[PDB]
Amino acid sequence: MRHIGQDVPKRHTHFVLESRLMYEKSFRDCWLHSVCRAISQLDEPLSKTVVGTHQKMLQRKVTCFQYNQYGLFKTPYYRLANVDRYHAVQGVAGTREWVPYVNVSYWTMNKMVRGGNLLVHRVHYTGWGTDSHLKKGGWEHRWNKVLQRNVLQYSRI
Amino acid sequence: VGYTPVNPDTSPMVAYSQYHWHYNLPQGMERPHSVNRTFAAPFQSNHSLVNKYRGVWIEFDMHPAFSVALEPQLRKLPRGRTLPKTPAEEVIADYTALAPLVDDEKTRDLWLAKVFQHCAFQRCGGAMELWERYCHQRFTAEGATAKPPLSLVKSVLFYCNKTDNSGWRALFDRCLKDGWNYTPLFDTAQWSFMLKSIGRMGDEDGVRAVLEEMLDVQADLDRVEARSVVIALNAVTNADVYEFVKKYLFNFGERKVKFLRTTYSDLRGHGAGKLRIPLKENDNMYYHVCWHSSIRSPRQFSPRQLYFDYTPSTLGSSSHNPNAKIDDIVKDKIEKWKAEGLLPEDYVHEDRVYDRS
Amino acid sequence: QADRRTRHHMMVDGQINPREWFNWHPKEYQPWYFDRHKFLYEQRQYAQFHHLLCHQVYLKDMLHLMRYPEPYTHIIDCRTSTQKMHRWVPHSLWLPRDEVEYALQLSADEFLDMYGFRKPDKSDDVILLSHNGIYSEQAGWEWKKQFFQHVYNYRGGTNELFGESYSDMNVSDVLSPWKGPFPQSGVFVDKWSKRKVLTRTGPFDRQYEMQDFALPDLELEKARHPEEGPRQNMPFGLQ
Amino acid sequence: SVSGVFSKGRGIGHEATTSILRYIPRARVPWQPSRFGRENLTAADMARLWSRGRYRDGPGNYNSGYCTERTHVLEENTVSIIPRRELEKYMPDITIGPKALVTPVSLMNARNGHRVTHDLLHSYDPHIGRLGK
RNA sequence: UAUGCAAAUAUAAAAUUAUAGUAAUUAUAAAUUAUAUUAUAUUAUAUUUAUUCAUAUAAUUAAUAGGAUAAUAUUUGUAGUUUUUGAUACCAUGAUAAGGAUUAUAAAUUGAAAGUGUUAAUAUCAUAAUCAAAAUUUAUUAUUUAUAUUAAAUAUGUAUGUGUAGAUAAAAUAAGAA
Ligand SMILES: O=c1ccn([C@@H]2O[C@H](COP(=O)(O)OP(=O)(O)OP(=O)(O)O)[C@@H](O)[C@H]2O)c(=O)[nH]1
């Protein structure tokens, strides 16, 4: 500690591990927090079994439990900073300084593509690439096609 | 380039260089590999077998008619992996009151073996009178010719080991090869219990005899629990049996000796509360076990610790040493010449230079 | 505080510092087992002779052969210095190791008329006995070089068979301290960076480490080191 | 001219094994012979180091509710901690205790192997929270 | 601005400088180096549109450890403090960007290598790092203009003033310009 015999060239690389740990905490708490939030603010009666006071008292108690839950992962994903795992450079998702597939910053992506470190193919800079969906509608169309392939393809039981 | 390494599997430049397969060249398997077939390792698990019985089995098997007849009595005796908590004196009284009635030597022996097992589980030392009442007259006395059942002898050994009784030798000597020859049928659990009991009892010759018999009969030293071996080897103090233990310790495997050292250290240190009876201090055996583990284990390299006090030669470091002795080399040469005989033998040599210290 | 034996300087007293983790060829770090308690010729010193080692024969086998002999197992007593030998091992034939190199080159009659017995036919088993089983092993090397099918060595030999103490080829397990500098034959140069690197040989090697290692007996070990710790010349965290 | 992050440390094994085990050399790591881990820290140093682990809602943070300092200097302007009694007047007190943090085994699978809501991930293997014990 | 007063480069020569003593030779030459289309001729340039531009916070980076249906390891629960010193709040070698002026129709692309914060040898008090709810003074940024106006993570109260000074931005590619 205190930069005495540091092994990693960059101190900030440990923030990547910290971000992974916060993602794991989100994995733990994403169900309990969502269930508590859903129960707390549901005005309509839950069912025949619980109505009126038996429901409002339960909502108050579950909200109290959620508040008492120390260390619950409240923060959303979009507000968690993204830091490269190669050079610990911060980039914000949605801009051009971060790529979604490789999870590395713009500078790291440029360095890796300019060297040989990531098998990618070159396309025209002012085009829509080679994907049919991108040519058809663009980013939103390919996003919707990903949704359709994932969920809407299945006739759920 | 840089401090961060480059992974060749992900980097396409390495994968497509002249030292790997280019993507234009056909992609196909080259030199199929068979590692699991040429030399397959046995399954050694770091974690112990969870479903193991972890105890001595008595091989209870009697005639079904006798078993169902004695079922009301046998409910109190232990069943397969089921141990009732009936008081031991109750079953002892039931046996001493009902054994003459049932006319079957094998059934009586099995019932007495179950009684011994139950009283051993309860650690009730009063049941040896049952052995003296029933078995001692005909199975082991003044050259008894009877052949006791394996179940009964195993149960008696388990009971005597549990109660730390001093009468186990009279039965073990009969159970050697020249007598009953029941040694090869003893389970590794039985051997571990015997070793632990003898180590607690502090018998110097018992441990040596048991270890030699185990090696002779091919008992599985690796599967014998480490704690029993540690307790057995803690009690040796005499020089002869200590030398025997030193030469015998090479039979165990490398992992076994390493974990023997680990268990010995933790038990005589932090794990002193693990044992019901604290272990006596035997620093000689502790040091020898640690040393033997160090010998057996592969030796790493620690150059700084090895050569911390290393000093170069006088002639090698003369230029870098301000006050070093150089006439010592001439003196050594003169001594070598005198030993060779070229110089006169034992000729008086005066100092060639001043002494600067 | 800082010391010449604790700092990282590459060169001390003009020679390569052996106290640097980066100053040693990587093959030295590879795991290895102690072998000083093994047989003399099974130790790592005879690396070029390891491929020529003979098989074994034990006391039980030797006693069984003495009680019940067989026509085609030549028991060769390869002991020199006839003044030392007193007893006769049964069913033994005298073929000294100092003469075996030429003896194995002779023909059948050429060997019979010189040694009083015929050639072992290069197919029958031969079992070699000598003091401490040293000359017997050295002779078994020659027999194997002459391509005899079955050559066995009796480790311990007549010395352990008759309970005497004869030490042919007097050799001391310990070695005298390396008074000279590090030999040039042990200096390793990197094939890429061309840096000078050391090797476990000369002044420091595995034999020196083994002979310096601690004794098995605690009461004898405590005699070597002084009171209040075995090693106090070094800092607390380097021991 | 010697500087040190921690001025005192304690050993792991007590005075029943080390006195005999010291005679056997230990092959320490060649490039770092002296090591100093968390299990080797003193009680106060280990406590103050573990308090600083959590980003917030932890004793290390100056304003997390579990601090112990009487005052905190903020931008060259001293400030006084509002005690729990004074906070209670306008902050309603809801507190269940250790039972609230823990969750049932049937919910452990849904919570992905975690039975504790504590912000430090608790693992049941005896190797991650590996202190001396 | 020739009337007087005034020999004067058109060369008989001996390495530079110097009173014909001062220093150690002195000069000179060639090649190359960013300033100058010419008026049919390897291209008609000349039109449209636009310009009130702003944001960063609460300190500890230096180990491996396997579990059900497997012929048996409590290795259940694996326990040896302390001699080193840089990418950190300067500095601590290299490396990718932006920047259209002459190789043209043709079976064709209108974006450059001359270098842009993070990356691989110089050290010598350095704990500066997001996990929410936060503090314009800083060159490099296309905002919605007068029928209907705040519901889900909390999300902009300011400047109506004759399409209005100076200064300045963009486009000759499925578009329409000679
Ligand atoms: O290998 C192990 C590990 C742990 N133990 C623990 O030892 C405790 C008792 O301590 P001991 O193991 O010293 O007593 P004992 O000789 O009477 O034990 P048994 O042979 O009858 O088992 C027991 O309660 C058990 O959990 C073992 O007996 N053996």
For the residues of B130-198, what is the DSSP string, one character each? HHHHHTTTTTSSSS------HHHHHHHHHHHHHHT-S-HHHHHHHTSTTTT--GGG--HHHHHHHHHHH
Angle C124-C127-C131 from CA coordinates, rounded to 5°: 160
Strands ordered across the beta sheet of C151-153: C55-56, C151-153, C125-129, C73-77, C92-94
The rounded distance, in Å, linking the Cα atoms of D17 and A65 is 49
Q: How many whole angstroms separate alpha carbon B253 and alpha carbon D2?
A: 47
Cβ–Cβ under 8 Å, residues B258 and B296: yes
The dihedral built from the CA positions of residue A60, A64, A69 and A74, taken in this order, carries a sign that is positive
B266-305 residues labelled b (16+ CB within 10 A) or e (exposed)? bbbbbeeeeeeeebeebeebbbbbbbbbbbbbebebbbbb
- The helix (H) or strand (E) run that includes residue B128 is helix B128-134
Q: Which residues of chain D lie closer than 8 angstroms to B234, CB-CB? A: none
After which residues is chain A discontinuous, taking C to N > 2.5 Å?
A: none
What is the CA(D1)–ligand 1 centre distance, in A? 54
Tokens of B268: 């005589």
Cα diameter, chain D: 65
* Ligand 1 pocket: which of B274, B275, B277, B279 to mutate (most atoms within 8 A of CB): B274
One-letter identity of residue B15: A
Asked if residue C198 lies in contact with residue C18, where contact means CB atoms within 8 angstroms, the answer is yes
Beta carbons within 8 Å of B184's beta carbon, 6+ residues apart: B217, B218
Number of Cβ within 10 Å of residue B252's Cβ equals: 20
- Rounded to whole angstroms, the Cα distance separating C152 from C58 reads 10
Given phi > 0 = left and psi -120 to 50 = alpha, else beta, which region is C106?
Answer: beta
Q: Which of A87, A68, B236 is nearest to D57 (CA)?
A: A68
Q: Could you identify the atom of ligand 1 that is nearest to the CA of residue B196?
A: 16
The long-range contacts involving C146-149, CB below 8 angstroms and separated by at least 24 positions, are C146/C104, C146/C122, C147/C122, C148/C120, C148/C122, C149/C122, C149/C123, C149/C125
Structural contact between residues D60 and D54, judged by C-beta atoms closer than 8 angstroms: yes
The CA angle C187-C189-C192, to the nearest 5 degrees, is: 170
Q: Strands C125-129, C151-153: parallel, antiparallel or unpaired by DSSP?
A: parallel
Closest to B12 (Cβ–Cβ): which among A9, A86, A119? A119
**Matching residue, tokens 């170069």:** B312
B37 labeled binding residue: no
* C16 phi, psi to nearest 5 deg: -65, 130
Structural contact between residues C188 and C198, judged by C-beta atoms closer than 8 angstroms: yes
* Residues in contact with A63: Cβ distance below 8 Å, sequence separation at least 6, in sequence order: A36, A40
Whether B234 contacts B201, CB under 8 Å: no
> Alpha carbon of C115 to those of B165, C95, C104: distances in Å?
67, 8, 11
Q: Return all residues near C69 (Cβ < 8 A) that are at least 6 apart.
A: C90, C91
Coil/strand/helix, residue C33 = coil
Per DSSP, the three-state class of C143 is helix
Give the tokens for residue C173. Answer: 């397990």
**C-alpha of residue B230 to centroid of ligand 1, in Å:** 13
The angle at the Cα of A122, spanning A119 to A125, to the nearest 5 degrees, equals 140
Residue B153 has, within 13 A of its CA and on its CB side, a CA count of: 24
Is residue B196 within 6 Å of ligand 1 at its C-beta? yes
Tokens of C60: 């039980």
Q: CA gyration radius for chain D?
A: 21
Residue A136's SS3 state is helix
Q: How far apart are CA B176 and CA C154, in angstroms?
A: 32
Written as six digits, the tokens of D48 are: 């103050």
* Residue B205: φ, ψ to 5°: -90, -25
B324: Cβ below 6 Å to ligand 1? no
Chain B residues close to A117, C-beta within 8 Å:
6, 10-13
Residue with tokens 């439990």: A65
The residues with which C126 forms a beta bridge, in sequence order, are: C74, C151
The span from the CA of B232 to the CA of C44, in Å, is 35
Element housing B287 (H / E): helix B283-296
- In this structure, the strands spanning A82-83 and A90-91 are antiparallel
Q: How far is the CA of B263 from the C1' of E76 (A)?
A: 12
How far, in Å, CA of B257 to CA of B269, rounded?
Answer: 18
The single residue listed with the structure tokens 């010391």 is C3
Q: Provide long-range contacts, Cβ within 8 A and 24+ apart, for D117-126.
A: D117/A29, D117/A32, D117/A69, D117/A70, D117/A71, D117/A72, D118/A70, D118/A71, D119/A25, D119/A70, D119/A71, D119/D54, D119/D57, D119/D58, D120/A71, D120/D53, D120/D54, D121/A21, D121/A24, D121/A25, D121/A28
Which of B52, B193, B196, when mutated, tests ligand 1's pocket best, judged by the most ligand atoms within 8 Å of its CB? B196
**How far, in Å, CA of A83 to CA of A86, rounded?**
9
Determine whether the interchain pair D25/B269 forms a contact, defined as Cβ–Cβ distance below 8 Å. no
Q: Torsions phi, psi of A93, nearest 5? A: -65, 145
For this PDB entry, the determination method is cryo-EM
Residue B300 in contact with partner chain D when CB distance is under 8 A: yes
Backbone angles phi, psi at C77, to 5 degrees: -95, 90
Q: Is residue A103 within 8 Å of A88, Cβ to Cβ?
A: no
Give this entry's resolution in angstroms: 3.7
Q: Which helix (H) or strand (E) holds C99?
A: helix C97-103
Helix, strand, coil % in chain C, rounded to nearest 5: 30, 10, 55
Q: Which residues contact C154 (CB under 8 A, 6 or more apart)?
A: C57, C62, C127, C128, C129, C133, C136, C161
